[PDB]
Motif scaffolding. Structure first.
Motif, PDB file in Angstrom:
ATOM      1  N   UNK A 274       7.151   6.178  -7.283  1.00 12.90           N
ATOM      2  CA  UNK A 274       7.992   6.931  -6.347  1.00 12.90           C
ATOM      3  C   UNK A 274       7.520   8.358  -6.150  1.00 12.90           C
ATOM      4  N   UNK A 275       7.108   9.001  -7.246  1.00  9.99           N
ATOM      5  CA  UNK A 275       6.648  10.388  -7.212  1.00  9.99           C
ATOM      6  C   UNK A 275       5.935  10.782  -8.500  1.00  9.99           C
TER       7      UNK A 275
ATOM      8  N   UNK B  91      -3.269  10.248  -0.462  1.00 13.97           N
ATOM      9  CA  UNK B  91      -4.607  10.282  -1.057  1.00 13.97           C
ATOM     10  C   UNK B  91      -4.587  10.540  -2.569  1.00 13.97           C
ATOM     11  N   UNK B  92      -3.549  11.228  -3.032  1.00 12.60           N
ATOM     12  CA  UNK B  92      -3.478  11.685  -4.412  1.00 12.60           C
ATOM     13  C   UNK B  92      -2.992  10.597  -5.345  1.00 12.60           C
ATOM     14  N   UNK B  93      -3.513  10.628  -6.566  1.00 10.34           N
ATOM     15  CA  UNK B  93      -3.128   9.712  -7.618  1.00 10.34           C
ATOM     16  C   UNK B  93      -2.846  10.518  -8.873  1.00 10.34           C
TER      17      UNK B  93
ATOM     18  N   UNK C 202       0.833  -1.191   0.000  1.00  7.92           N
ATOM     19  CA  UNK C 202       0.000   0.000   0.000  1.00  7.92           C
ATOM     20  C   UNK C 202       0.872   1.246   0.000  1.00  7.92           C
ATOM     21  N   UNK C 203       0.464   2.230  -0.792  1.00 13.91           N
ATOM     22  CA  UNK C 203       1.126   3.525  -0.804  1.00 13.91           C
ATOM     23  C   UNK C 203       0.618   4.442   0.295  1.00 13.91           C
TER      24      UNK C 203
ATOM     25  N   UNK D  11      -1.157   5.094  -5.687  1.00  9.92           N
ATOM     26  CA  UNK D  11      -0.671   6.132  -4.746  1.00  9.92           C
ATOM     27  C   UNK D  11       0.863   6.109  -4.657  1.00  9.92           C
ATOM     28  N   UNK D  12       1.457   7.214  -4.221  1.00  9.67           N
ATOM     29  CA  UNK D  12       2.912   7.257  -4.050  1.00  9.67           C
ATOM     30  C   UNK D  12       3.358   6.229  -2.993  1.00  9.67           C
ATOM     31  N   UNK D  13       4.372   5.430  -3.316  1.00  7.09           N
ATOM     32  CA  UNK D  13       4.873   4.405  -2.402  1.00  7.09           C
ATOM     33  C   UNK D  13       4.277   3.033  -2.686  1.00  7.09           C
TER      34      UNK D  13
END
Ligand SMILES: C=CC[C@@H]1/C=C(\C)C[C@H](C)C[C@H](OC)[C@H]2O[C@@](O)(C(=O)C(=O)N3CCCC[C@H]3C(=O)O[C@H](/C(C)=C/[C@@H]3CC[C@@H](O)[C@H](OC)C3)[C@H](C)[C@@H](O)CC1=O)[C@H](C)C[C@@H]2OC
Length: 237
Positions: free
Chosen positions: A114-115, A23-25, A19-20, A77-79
């Motif tokens: 990653x970003x 909230x942002x995608x 899981x990242x 998600x990031x991560x």
């Protein structure tokens, strides 16, 4: 795996491994940074970015990558680390991609996000006008110089609202209505019905002058939430 193809035909299946965060995608237009490994269905490893120097980078939803990737990265998600299974219709189809990818091949990718960052809309690519699309517009046409546009805008300085208006105006005449030049440039990159957030560095906003009646000092960064509601394109030469 969960079916994430918009046609729900099992073209793209996704399993989350880690899981990242947050909230942002990433959205269409965003620049994305990943590591990936790719396998054929029988288990043959055909490529990995981990064997190379840096992360793999691309612009989302601009058709630079196979369809499966546009679809899948938009859900991450990031991560996050996920595995996606991609039918040939959503990858390389009949053509394949020789020598690595044979005809009509189902692919498996392990992807780590990653970003991501918003799209730089400046001619000089100096980060002075950044867009994050919230919801894509309905048409493909975009306003040109001299177009009459109908916009709804909210302008923020250090997260305080200084301007909220619905305006009808000619692109190229915005200065008279207290709109910054960078905002007019951004609107020329929008589709009808598009909802987006635009970040402006001082050179692309009110610069060294500022805007006294909006309580904006010299050398201020600004943020606008914008809807392009409609436009009529102007005649060009
Ligand atoms: C400017 C020079 C070439 C340029 C090369 C690079 C920048 C280096 C970049 C890491 C490529 C890799 O080289 C180590 C290698 O990556 C693969 O191994 C791979 O793991 C893969 O599937 N990826 C890469 C990661 C994202 C998804 C996918 C992809 O969609 O990749 C994209 C792809 C091929 C799209 C085709 C384009 C043609 C359409 O017809 C087809 O539409 C059906 C879709 C890539 C990124 C292109 O946008 C850019 C390029 O091609 C391919 C199996 C073959 C490819 O070598 C070429």
């Amino acid at each position: 795996g969960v079916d994430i193809s918009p046609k729900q035909d099992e073209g793209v299946l996704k399993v989350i491994k880690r899981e990242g965060t947050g909230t942002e995608m990433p959205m269409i237009g965003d620049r994305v940074f990943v590591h990936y490994t790719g396998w054929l269905l029988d288990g043959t490893k055909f490529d990995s970015s981990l064997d190379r120097k840096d992360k793999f980078s691309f612009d989302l939803g601009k058709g630079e990558v196979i369809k499966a990737w546009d679809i899948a990265i938009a859900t991450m998600k990031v991560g996050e680390v996920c595995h996606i299974t991609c039918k040939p219709e959503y990858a390389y189809g009949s053509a394949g991609s020789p020598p690595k990818i044979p005809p009509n091949a189902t692919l498996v990718f392990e992807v780590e996000l990653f970003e991501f960052k918003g799209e730089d809309l400046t001619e000089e690519e100096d980060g002075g006008i950044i867009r994050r699309i919230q919801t894509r517009g309905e048409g493909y046409a975009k306003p040109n110089e001299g177009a009459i546009v109908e916009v709804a805008l909210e302008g923020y300085y250090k997260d305080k609202l200084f301007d909220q208006r619905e305006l009808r105006f000619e692109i190229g005449e915005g200065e008279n209505l207290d709109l910054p030049y960078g905002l007019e440039r951004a609107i020329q990159r929008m589709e009808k019905g598009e909802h987006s957030i635009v970040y402006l560095k001082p050179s692309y906003a009110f610069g060294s002058v500022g805007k006294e009646k909006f309580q904006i000092p010299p050398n201020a960064e600004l943020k606008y939430e914008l809807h392009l509601k409609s436009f009529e394109k102007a005649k060009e030469s």
